[PDB]
C-alpha cells in the first residue's frame, strides 16, 4: 500500500514512518530538506516538498498522506494554515485518506487551540474528502504512552479504517 508521510523526520511521524515500513508499505517520505532522512532512507521513496508547496499531483500517487506536520518551532505557528492548504487541495476528492496526527497535552505539534481550529475547518468540509483526525491516549515523553505504540494505532487505522472522516482519540 501507497503511504506517504509529511513531517517524516519529527518524533511521531518517525516512528508512523517505521511502522509503516515494517508493516510491508511502499512508503515515501515528504520533506522540505532530505537532509537528516537521506542517511537513514535509502531505501524509501523520497519527495523534497513543504507542505505548502504540496499539489493534488503528488498527493494523488499515495493512498494514504499522514499529515505528522509540526517538526520545529516555525511549523508549530502554521499548523491551521497548512492543513488549510490540504484541504483546499483535496477538496471533492477520496483519492488519498488524509490521516491528520495530533498529540494532547519543545512540542512542536499542534496546539490545543490550534487543533480545534483544524477540527472546526475539517468539520467545514465534513463530507467534501476523504479525512480522519487521530489524537493519542495519553502523554509521550523523550526515550501511559510511547511514540511507538501511537504509531502503531495510527497504522492500524490505516490498514482497518474505523473512523474515515472523523477525529477520534485511542483508546485502551
Given at each position: 500500500m501507497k503511504i506517504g508521510i509529511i513531517g517524516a523526520t519529527?518524533?511521531?511521524g518517525?516512528?508512523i514512518l517505521?511502522?509503516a515500513k515494517?508493516?510491508?508499505h511502499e512508503v515515501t517520505a515528504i520533506v522540505?530538506?532530505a537532509?537528516?532522512i537521506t542517511?537513514?532512507h535509502?531505501d524509501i521513496n523520497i519527495l523534497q516538498k513543504?507542505i505548502?508547496?504540496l499539489?493534488?499531483s503528488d498527493l494523488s500517487d499515495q493512498n494514504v498522506v499522514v499529515d505528522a506536520?509540526?517538526?520545529?518551532?516555525?511549523?508549530?505557528?502554521?499548523?491551521?494554515?497548512?492543513?488549510?492548504?490540504?484541504?483546499?487541495?483535496?477538496?471533492?476528492?477520496?483519492?488519498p485518506?488524509?490521516?491528520?496526527?495530533?498529540?494532547?497535552?519543545?512540542?512542536?505539534?499542534?496546539?490545543?487551540?490550534?487543533?480545534?481550529?483544524?477540527?472546526?475547518?475539517?468539520?467545514?468540509?465534513?463530507?467534501?474528502?476523504?479525512?480522519?483526525?487521530?489524537?493519542?491516549?495519553?502523554?509521550?515523553?523523550?526515550?501511559?504512552?510511547?511514540?511507538?505504540?501511537?504509531?502503531?494505532?495510527?497504522?492500524?487505522?490505516?490498514?482497518?479504517?474505523?473512523?474515515?472522516?472523523?477525529?477520534?482519540?485511542?483508546?485502551?
Amino acid at each position: 500500500m501507497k503511504i506517504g508521510i509529511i513531517g517524516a523526520t519529527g518524533r511521531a511521524g518517525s516512528r508512523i514512518l517505521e511502522e509503516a515500513k515494517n508493516r510491508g508499505h511502499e512508503v515515501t517520505a515528504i520533506v522540505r530538506n532530505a537532509g537528516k532522512i537521506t542517511q537513514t532512507h535509502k531505501d524509501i521513496n523520497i519527495l523534497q516538498k513543504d507542505i505548502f508547496d504540496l499539489t493534488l499531483s503528488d498527493l494523488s500517487d499515495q493512498n494514504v498522506v499522514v499529515d505528522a506536520y509540526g517538526i520545529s518551532p516555525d511549523e508549530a505557528e502554521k499548523h491551521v494554515t497548512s492543513l488549510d492548504h490540504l484541504i483546499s487541495v483535496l477538496n471533492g476528492t477520496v483519492s488519498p485518506r488524509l490521516l491528520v496526527v495530533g498529540g494532547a497535552a519543545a512540542p512542536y505539534y499542534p496546539t490545543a487551540r490550534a487543533q480545534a481550529k483544524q477540527l472546526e475547518h475539517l468539520k467545514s468540509h465534513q463530507a467534501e474528502f476523504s479525512w480522519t483526525y487521530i489524537s493519542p491516549s495519553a502523554m509521550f515523553e523523550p526515550g501511559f504512552i510511547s511514540m511507538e505504540d501511537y504509531a502503531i494505532a495510527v497504522l492500524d487505522e490505516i490498514e482497518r479504517p474505523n473512523h474515515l472522516n472523523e477525529h477520534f482519540t485511542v483508546a485502551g
